[PDB]
Amino acid sequence: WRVYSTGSNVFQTRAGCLIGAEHVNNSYECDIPIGAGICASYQQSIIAYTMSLGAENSVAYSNNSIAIPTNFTISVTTE
Amino acid sequence: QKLIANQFNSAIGKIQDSLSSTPSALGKLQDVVNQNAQALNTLVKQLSSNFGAISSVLNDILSRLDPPEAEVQIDRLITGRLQSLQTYVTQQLIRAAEIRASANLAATKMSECVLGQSKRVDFCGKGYHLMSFPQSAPHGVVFLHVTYVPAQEKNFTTAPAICHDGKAHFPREGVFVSNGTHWFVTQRNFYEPQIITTDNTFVSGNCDVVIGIVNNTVYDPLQPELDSFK
Amino acid sequence: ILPVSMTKTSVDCTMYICGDSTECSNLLLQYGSFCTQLNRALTGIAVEQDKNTQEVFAQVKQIYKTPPIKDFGGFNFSQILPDPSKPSKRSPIEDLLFNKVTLAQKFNGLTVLPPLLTDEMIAQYTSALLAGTITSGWTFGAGPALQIPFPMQMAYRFNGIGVTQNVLYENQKLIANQFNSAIGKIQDSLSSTPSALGKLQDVVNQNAQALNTLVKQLSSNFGAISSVLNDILSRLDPPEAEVQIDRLITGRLQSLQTYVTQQLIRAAEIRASANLAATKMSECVLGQSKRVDFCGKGYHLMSFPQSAPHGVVFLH
Amino acid sequence: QIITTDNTFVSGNCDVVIGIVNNTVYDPLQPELDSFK
Ligand SMILES: *[C@@H]1O[C@H](CO)[C@@H](O[C@@H]2O[C@H](CO)[C@@H](O)[C@H](O)[C@H]2NC(C)=O)[C@H](O)[C@H]1NC(C)=O
Ligand SMILES: *[C@@H]1O[C@H](CO)[C@@H](O[C@@H]2O[C@H](CO)[C@@H](O)[C@H](O)[C@H]2NC(C)=O)[C@H](O)[C@H]1NC(C)=O
Ligand SMILES: *[C@@H]1O[C@H](CO)[C@@H](O[C@@H]2O[C@H](CO)[C@@H](O)[C@H](O)[C@H]2NC(C)=O)[C@H](O)[C@H]1NC(C)=O
Ligand SMILES: *[C@@H]1O[C@H](CO)[C@@H](O[C@@H]2O[C@H](CO)[C@@H](O)[C@H](O)[C@H]2NC(C)=O)[C@H](O)[C@H]1NC(C)=O
Ligand SMILES: *[C@@H]1O[C@H](CO)[C@@H](O[C@@H]2O[C@H](CO)[C@@H](O)[C@H](O)[C@H]2NC(C)=O)[C@H](O)[C@H]1NC(C)=O
Ligand SMILES: *[C@@H]1O[C@H](CO)[C@@H](O[C@@H]2O[C@H](CO)[C@@H](O)[C@H](O)[C@H]2NC(C)=O)[C@H](O)[C@H]1NC(C)=O
Ligand SMILES: *[C@@H]1O[C@H](CO)[C@@H](O)[C@H](O)[C@H]1NC(C)=O
Ligand SMILES: *[C@@H]1O[C@H](CO)[C@@H](O)[C@H](O)[C@H]1NC(C)=O
Ligand SMILES: *[C@@H]1O[C@H](CO)[C@@H](O)[C@H](O)[C@H]1NC(C)=O
């Protein structure tokens, strides 16, 4: 049972210690909840990172600039 | 109309594949079934426990000891089983309250979305709301929200008002937009430029009141008709 | 002000009740699967709190940023946008909210789990929602974000409550001054009375009181000889030590069960409040509502959500 | 009520719409301007 106790791959988090999960400084979506804004996913190995919130979309804004659609699309959303 | 029909037809046919793609799509009903099933299984399993008594079987209790002494063991077993049943009933009551809240939400959704339009945002799926269709479910209801979401947007330079002979002009229904050389009036939710004066503009005040204003020709088609009588 | 999520908690049945004493622990298994049910209920409550927070605050699939230059200088939004000077990214009103809430400690068998969404990311979500409702107006919640000048958005919003566009543009200076004055005044009104944020202090304090009551019940013997199992194990003979330890086990188990039931009721109430808050957000900030008195007294124009230590606050 | 050009709005060509019907739309301008030729 203690075979998964190697200290070379131990990653310390804000919500406990992690064993066997690689730590990467990049940003991705929420795959598996961990706690304190950390989520783990599958790359070969398991990567645990810091949570990210979508992709940044800086909308260009000005006091005389407006945007209106020229086309539509109909979608059906289940519930 | 043909394009709208094509989009609606191609959208509904994608619902079957989306639902059948993964078993996790129907989680909100499988969870409801599973929690009750597992609670009932746990209540059944609680029957075969000693609860601190000599044995968990009633027949062994009667056979091993005399009634005057087996009364205490029977009392212990009865108290334990009553506690288990009471906690199961309390859990079922709380779950029933949660399901009643969900059912009231579903009834409100039916009565609003299915039986009419709804101006409540995000209450009818992402985007603007059109007619909706319900579907029966084993232990619930499944909706289909036919939404209208704009796409392929392009930006124009706008201005709140148009100058005309020292008289401010405002859009009756829409927003002034310009493609860099000429100004037009269009509905706010779809690009469809038109001429300005004929019906979609109303007059109020002078040009010195508003802050950012632009000059443009305001041409009433009434006047060319009058010149036809000259 | 609306609570959105209570603090996550979880208790170890054997560790809490039996004190990790061996024989007394193996005697507990005779009582059945009472240990598993409470753990499962607490796990469900914690995951429900996490789901409530995510549902209330993660209402957008993209994160938006305010323009570097405030070209809407008529209206002044510095009191709600994320202040960059402070080490924290919370807005000045958010910072005032955080410092106005005060008392959750580790113990023998009780723990607290951190939320999935940390406070900084909750503030980031609120900033994204505010930037979306400031720059793109009400249409960023329906589809792709469409840029539109803020005075024009206010003109639309006025047009949506039965008054034409003449009123705003001819009185833009007055409207901007009144809006700035009100936004300045709400901060003073909130900071004036500590009991203003009572709807969150209430839930925090009452959860803490429930936890303390659960812990304080250790000292009660429930009619047994003593409150410590060590004395019973090292003093009395097993034939009656078993009966005494069984009575103590029954008492502690009943106490933990009633705490679990109270937490379940509290979680149901908080889930109802969080669903109401999510509906209020999706109908107020991401659009316009014709529902009178659902969005504050008077006809509704906009709404600016702001984070809270354990909930969300709305500036209608 | 009678179909008048001040009651309906016009935009587009006849061919694109499916299901149209031929008819005449009254014009309040024509009889007022006819009396002042
Ligand atoms: C508006 O968007 C629709 C698709 O959302 C466009 O329809 C497509 O048109 C192209 C070429 O005309 C076809 O190859 C596609 O198959 C069409 N899509 C569908 C779903 O039928 C439509 O042309 C767009 N409108 C304009 C004016 O460009
Ligand atoms: C902006 O829109 C106007 C709309 O009138 C464009 O002007 C038209 O351009 C077409 C191009 O072939 C001509 O056939 C029309 O006669 C023009 N109309 C008028 C009234 O001049 C103009 O080209 C557009 N400009 C841009 C940059 O898109
Ligand atoms: C939008 O904002 C820009 C940036 O300030 C304004 O441009 C300035 O306008 C003032 C007042 O007319 C001029 O004195 C400056 O020379 C302008 N600077 C630049 C770089 O253009 C613009 O007027 C604003 N537009 C509206 C409608 O408010
Ligand atoms: C829009 O038109 C008005 C007048 O129709 C312009 O106001 C004039 O501005 C000039 C500035 O050189 C003055 O000499 C005139 O006396 C003004 N006329 C009036 C009646 O006040 C205004 O400048 C125009 N604006 C734009 C952007 O073209
Ligand atoms: C918008 O509101 C902010 C308030 O945060 C204004 O900044 C203050 O301006 C006063 C003016 O004397 C200063 O005394 C304060 O020190 C400023 N900071 C704060 C935190 O109050 C700002 O001037 C307003 N206007 C604009 C265009 O930003
Ligand atoms: C409505 O009137 C128009 C014009 O009078 C009709 O269009 C023409 O119809 C005739 C047959 O009656 C065709 O031979 C012509 O080729 C049509 N013109 C064009 C430009 O296509 C139209 O058919 C009438 N509507 C109906 C329903 O009969
Ligand atoms: C990832 O970033 C952290 C700091 O954010 C740094 O300590 C670490 O070395 C980085 N990892 C790699 C592989 O560069
Ligand atoms: C429209 O928006 C794009 C960015 O999405 C910007 O690059 C472009 O300049 C805008 N149009 C005009 C006319 O400025
Ligand atoms: C209506 O349907 C009938 C089918 O019986 C068809 O002949 C007719 O052309 C249709 N008319 C319109 C306007 O759709």
Curated annotation (Swiss-Prot), chain D:
Glycans are attached at residue 22. It comes from the Viruses. The chain holds residues 1113 to 1149 of 1273 of the full protein. This is Spike protein S2'. The gene is S. Subunit of the fusion protein that is processed upon entry into the host cell. Mediates fusion of the virion and cellular membranes by functioning as a class I viral fusion protein. Contains a viral fusion peptide that is unmasked after S2 cleavage. This cleavage can occur at the cell membrane by host TMPRSS2 or during endocytosis by host CSTL. In either case, this triggers an extensive and irreversible conformational change that leads to fusion of the viral envelope with the cellular cytoplasmic membrane, releasing viral genomic RNA into the host cell cytoplasm.
